[PDB]
Design a protein around this ligand. Structure first.
Ligand SMILES: O=C(Nc1ccc(N(Cc2ccsc2)C(=O)Cn2nnc3ccccc32)cc1)c1cccs1
Ligand SMILES: O=C(Nc1ccc(N(Cc2ccsc2)C(=O)Cn2nnc3ccccc32)cc1)c1cccs1
Lengths: 306, 306
């Protein structure tokens, strides 16, 4: 038992991290087969970060403009033989394929989904943590500018699913990046101008999953006979910065295991939002919405007790 | 910017995880050079868990009683050629040296210290998270049956420092294990009986470090001119379940970088302990005490704002 923020083991991803340098800028890249991926703003000079003309920048670089180095494991200096833009990513073709390329897929996650982040700095892995894609398609992470190119991923059956490459900090503790098709998460441009973020919301289904984990972990003081219909909850949610609730088979099974209905959990959310009344749930006095039902399922399988 | 619970990248450790089986019991082991470590309760039958005679069990076992397999990476079946007891651990000698043994050291962490855990099942790494050794030398992690032998570690300059091998669950969300000298963390025995846990406390120096992190991340509403001396706070702490404060150079450096004194922070703790009053700090409504000064230092390196 116990519930903690958990990441997928990072070894397979660590083997793919490289350092990329262009002019005075350096950051991290991901080396898969004969390709190195990094944010395209590595091309932008310090004095043009406000209005970068990436097409002009691209054309002003040679293959030799890009120095790519592997620091950890079997070291390497990699020769770039082509460079092009893929959305807000630079795609560098190199003359050697990464022999430690894992089996992998690219995916784009949806708001409310979690993934692991390998934080990197100057081509070296430095930390691992887990984030959730927020309702406004930002993440709440921990990065420096030199952390750009850090990689978000999930893992299933030995296959690494790459979903995120870190691009920018939007406001304090608030970040975004792109999927590996080069599409930025959220309504965000890779330039140094203030950009307005859409309002964030609590992911209701994740909160519900968390309350079920709490109950399976012996914490049930917040469960009352009170219930609220989904239609009523959803009207309330629109006025209180929560997402609309739509049930899933996974949630139904947690209901089954605990004897606590989804309508009771939605009622508890409404009550807890008004105040925790000096009490805690799994150590917290705020609602937790970054565990998905899948995340919770991985960490439970205990029997509900008395 | 941003502050998250950060774990050390796990690749070097993943390369060292094996499965160990003895009779009907299986769990995880750590393979370094020609040695495999695992909890000694792998020898215990399910009907003798309340009072195992580990010396007798040891003698009844032979080298061939132990089956050791590596299921990931370069897979292998390892022959056990010696076995001996090391406190609550078994030390198995195997006939093949782990070719991916990292540079490593062993140490025993103190209450208030953090470390990373690679959670494993059937000899397969499954998750990474960070914990803090509690005042009563338990950890609040996330472990299921089959996780015994999971490995806790830190990183010291290209060196993996192993500090924990998972042994048991004590109560909901409450765990302990041993360092690799075979000494159990805390006043706990590796048997299936209810054991009393000494009272836990908030780690004051960690809470202080967290408040400093908050300030460096632009959260400062809780900082008042009020100041409480160390001696006075330490009197207060004894009666309010906080550890006594003892200054260190880390914290001093954080105090200098931010210009805010320890006494102001100790004062803030007293006030926040009474209640956050609707406001939040880094998104929380409770005091956070599992970031060490060192953990905070690694995630800061911005300039102090206003
Ligand atoms: O600094 C440089 N470049 C730089 C690159 C990116 C950034 N930006 C904003 C941005 C995105 C596209 S253009 C400007 C970050 O967010 C970057 N970013 N991404 N995550 C961050 C966390 C903290 C601080 C910054 C962070 C800003 C600057 C240098 C260029 C030549 C020599 S140095
Ligand atoms: O089950 C078996 N053995 C077993 C081993 C350890 C355990 N224990 C308690 C304990 C510690 C020393 S002796 C008994 C756990 O805590 C184990 N542990 N460790 N972390 C746990 C988290 C959740 C639940 C249990 C957890 C209990 C049982 C079988 C033996 C032969 C066939 S099966």
């Amino acid at each position: 038992s116990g519930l903690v923020k958990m990441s997928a083991p990072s070894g397979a991803v660590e083997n793919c991290i490289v350092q990329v340098t262009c002019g005075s800028m350096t950051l991290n890249g991901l080396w898969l087969d004969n390709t190195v991926w990094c944010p395209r703003h590595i091309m932008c000079p310090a004095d043009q970060l406000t209005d970068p003309n990436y097409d002009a920048l691209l054309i002003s670089k040679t293959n030799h403009s890009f120095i790519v180095q592997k620091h950890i494991g079997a070291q390497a200096n990699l020769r770039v033989v082509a460079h092009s833009m893929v959305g807000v990513l630079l795609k560098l073709t190199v003359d050697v394929a990464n022999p430690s390329t894992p089996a992998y897929t690219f995916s784009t996650v949806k708001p409310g989904a979690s993934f692991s982040v390998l934080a990197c700095y100057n081509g070296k892995p430095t930390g691992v943590f887990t984030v959730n894609l927020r309702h406004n398609s930002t993440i709440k992470g921990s990065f420096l500018c030199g952390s750009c190119g850090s990689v978000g991923y999930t893992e299933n059956g030995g296959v690494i699913n790459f979903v995120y490459m870190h691009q920018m900090e939007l406001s304090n503790g608030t970040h975004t990046g792109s999927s590996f098709d080069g599409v930025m998460y959220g309504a965000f441009e890779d330039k140094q101008t203030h950009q307005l973020q859409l309002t964030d919301k609590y992911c209701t289904i994740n909160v519900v999953a968390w309350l079920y984990a709490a109950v399976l972990n012996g914490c049930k003081w917040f469960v009352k006979p009170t219930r609220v219909g989904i239609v009523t909850y959803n009207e309330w949610a629109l006025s209180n910065q929560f997402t609309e609730f739509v049930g899933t088979q996974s949630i139904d099974m947690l209901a089954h295991r605990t004897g606590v209905s989804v309508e009771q959990m939605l009622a508890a959310i409404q009550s807890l939002h008004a105040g925790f009344q000096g009490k805690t749930i799994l150590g917290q006095s705020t609602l937790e919405d970054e565990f998905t039902p899948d995340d919770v399922n991985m960490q439970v399988m205990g029997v509900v007790m008395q």
